[PDB]
Amino acid sequence: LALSLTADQMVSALLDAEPPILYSEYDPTRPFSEASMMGLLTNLADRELVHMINWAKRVPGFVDLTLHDQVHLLECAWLEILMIGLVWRSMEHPGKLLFAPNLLLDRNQGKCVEGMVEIFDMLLATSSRFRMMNLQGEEFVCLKSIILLNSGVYTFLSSTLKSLEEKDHIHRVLDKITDTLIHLMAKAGLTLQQQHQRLAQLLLILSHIRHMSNKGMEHLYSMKCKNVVPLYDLLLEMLDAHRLHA
Amino acid sequence: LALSLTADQMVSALLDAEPPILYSEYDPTRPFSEASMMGLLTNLADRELVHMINWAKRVPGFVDLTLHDQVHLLECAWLEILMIGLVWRSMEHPGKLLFAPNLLLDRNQGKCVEGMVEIFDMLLATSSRFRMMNLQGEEFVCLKSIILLNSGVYTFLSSTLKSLEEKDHIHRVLDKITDTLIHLMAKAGLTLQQQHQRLAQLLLILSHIRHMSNKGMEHLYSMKCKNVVPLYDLLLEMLDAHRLHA
Numbered sequence: 001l002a003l004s005l006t007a008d009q010m011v012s013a014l015l016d017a018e019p020p021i022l023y024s025e026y027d028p029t030r031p032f033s034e035a036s037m038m039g040l041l042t043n044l045a046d047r048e049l050v051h052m053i054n055w056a057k058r059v060p061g062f063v064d065l066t067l068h069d070q071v072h073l074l075e076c077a078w079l080e081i082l083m084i085g086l087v088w089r090s091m092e093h094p095g096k097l098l099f100a101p102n103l104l105l106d107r108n109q110g111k112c113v114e115g116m117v118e119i120f121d122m123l124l125a126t127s128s129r130f131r132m133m134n135l136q137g138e139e140f141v142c143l144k145s146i147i148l149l150n151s152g153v154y155t156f157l158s159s160t161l162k163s164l165e166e167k168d169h170i171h172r173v174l175d176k177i178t179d180t181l182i183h184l185m186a187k188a189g190l191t192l193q194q195q196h197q198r199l200a201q202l203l204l205i206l207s208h209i210r211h212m213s214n215k216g217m218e219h220l221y222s223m224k225c226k227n228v229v230p231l232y233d234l235l236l237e238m239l240d241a242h243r244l245h246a
Numbered sequence: 247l248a249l250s251l252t253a254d255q256m257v258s259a260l261l262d263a264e265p266p267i268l269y270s271e272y273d274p275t276r277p278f279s280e281a282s283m284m285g286l287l288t289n290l291a292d293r294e295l296v297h298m299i300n301w302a303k304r305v306p307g308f309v310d311l312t313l314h315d316q317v318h319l320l321e322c323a324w325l326e327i328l329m330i331g332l333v334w335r336s337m338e339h340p341g342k343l344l345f346a347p348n349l350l351l352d353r354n355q356g357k358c359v360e361g362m363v364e365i366f367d368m369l370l371a372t373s374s375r376f377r378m379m380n381l382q383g384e385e386f387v388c389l390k391s392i393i394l395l396n397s398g399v400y401t402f403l404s405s406t407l408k409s410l411e412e413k414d415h416i417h418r419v420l421d422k423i424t425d426t427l428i429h430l431m432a433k434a435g436l437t438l439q440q441q442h443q444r445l446a447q448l449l450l451i452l453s454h455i456r457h458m459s460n461k462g463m464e465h466l467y468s469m470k471c472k473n474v475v476p477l478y479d480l481l482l483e484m485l486d487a488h489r490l491h492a
């Protein structure tokens with residue numbers, strides 16, 4: 001039961017579920033000018049998605065939900081989740097975005113990546129904010145978890161009895177993550193006021209991540225494929241797994 | 247000095263700055279089928295904007311900022327501010343959106359308003375959430391203020407000394423509003439844990455309001471005018487006021 005976990009149990013659970021940092025797929029020995037930035041990012045995102053699924057399934061309370069709800073939450077939050085991870089790893093690289101350990105781009109270079117005319121600078125600003133706030137890994141994982149659960153909680157299908165139970169559960173887990181964040185801050189020696197203030201500062205950044213995701217999706221949709229299986233179905237295929245590999 | 251205000255002083259200040267509820271402009275005696283929903287909403291929004299300016303100038307700390315920064319914050323947050331007001335007044339009208347006291351539309355009716363294919367339902371969901379949470383007016387005004395100050399704090403021009411001072415001031419005011427929200431909750435008899443949890447629940451709703459604003463702007467831009475003075479300049483004209491009427 002995810003609702004019985006203690007703060008320390010929540011943090012350890014989340015830290016343990018952290019996905020790996022992937023590398024971009026390209027010939028390091030071959031010219032950089034040849035590669036396509038969007039092709040590289042698209043390929044990176046596609047590989048990260050599989051791992052994101054694995055991660056989501058390990059976020060306490062997520063698997064307690066229905067398959068359809070798990071799919072909806074991920075379809076809503078996937079890009080925000082990729083972006084917050086990106087901002088996090090770019091924290092110690094002022095002026096640059098570490099898309100991957102072998103793919104670090106600066107402002108000027110960004111000016112040439114399609115669909116990033118506005119968001120590159122927004123992402124840098126967010127990374128800078130995390131740096132000023134001295135965001136901790138324990139805090140980062142709670143935030144990423146909040147995004148996954150909060151993403152599409154208010155865009156759910158209907159109001160069936162099961163749907164009401166689902167929403168309630170999500171809000172209870174979210175409440176548990178808030179408690180965890182406060183605990184982490186209390187442990188760090190922050191005063192009560194400093195605790196409330198930091199919690200708020202952190203949650204307000206999530207509105208900026210949503211903004212960046214919306215702007216990114218606007219571009220991705222403006223170059224949408226044709227007869228390509230919908231994200232929903234791909235997520236479903238990956239989420240709707242059997243236990244034959246148990 | 248807005249930074250010296252007490253919680254009770256902050257709330258009274260915000261409540262006092264509340265803008266009036268405007269009416270839609272149309273012949274109540276004439277057929278409804280004749281009017282254009284987007285024309286009505288556009289005309290309503292335009293009139294609300296002037297009053298929003300007046301309101302912003304009365305949000306503690308806002309006028310301490312530069313004119314250019316005041317304009318940037320409003321250009322980023324204006325639609326979120328209109329939307330949160332809309333959700334707030336539709337709170338006691340399940341299944342309907344009270345665009346104005348003389349303009350209440352239900353789901354089915356929304357299905358016919360351009361640009362609202364997705365956001366109508368999202369707005370209803372938000373109103374429903376506020377209802378379940380039993381959101382208070384004192385809380386609502388703090389939230390609207392947070393939107394105004396948080397909106398474009400991370401999309402500011404450069405990093406000049408003045409810009410760094412500006413950002414710091416905004417974050418200090420935001421911190422003061424957080425304290426105010428916690429105070430309001432403590433006064434309502436909520437426990438410390440219930441306080442942190444509610445603060446988080448309220449701030450997470452702001453990410454959904456940002457989402458709705460982005461979707462709305464997507465449509466508005468898809469029907470953008472030509473030789474029409476940019477929003478920035480209109481906001482500037484309204485904000486850059488003289489004191490000859492003092």
Ligand SMILES: CC/C(=C(\c1ccc(O)cc1)c1ccc(OCCN(C)C)cc1)c1ccccc1
Nearest residue numbers: 041042044045082083086114115116216217219
């Ligand atoms: C911010 C970089 C980025 C992507 C990205 C972000 C973080 C990360 O870890 C990896 C990639 C990005 C780019 C493309 C993309 O494609 C997904 C859609 N495919 C399935 C067609 C996803 C993310 C992007 C998104 C929208 C527009 C421009 C760039």
Ligand SMILES: CC/C(=C(\c1ccc(O)cc1)c1ccc(OCCN(C)C)cc1)c1ccccc1
Nearest residue numbers: 287288290291328329332360361362462463465
């Ligand atoms: C949600 C209703 C709405 C508007 C609205 C919201 C709250 C409120 O109090 C009043 C209106 C809306 C519609 C049009 C609009 O136009 C502004 C641009 N003009 C200057 C060209 C602004 C808001 C809207 C926005 C985008 C798409 C579809 C509808």
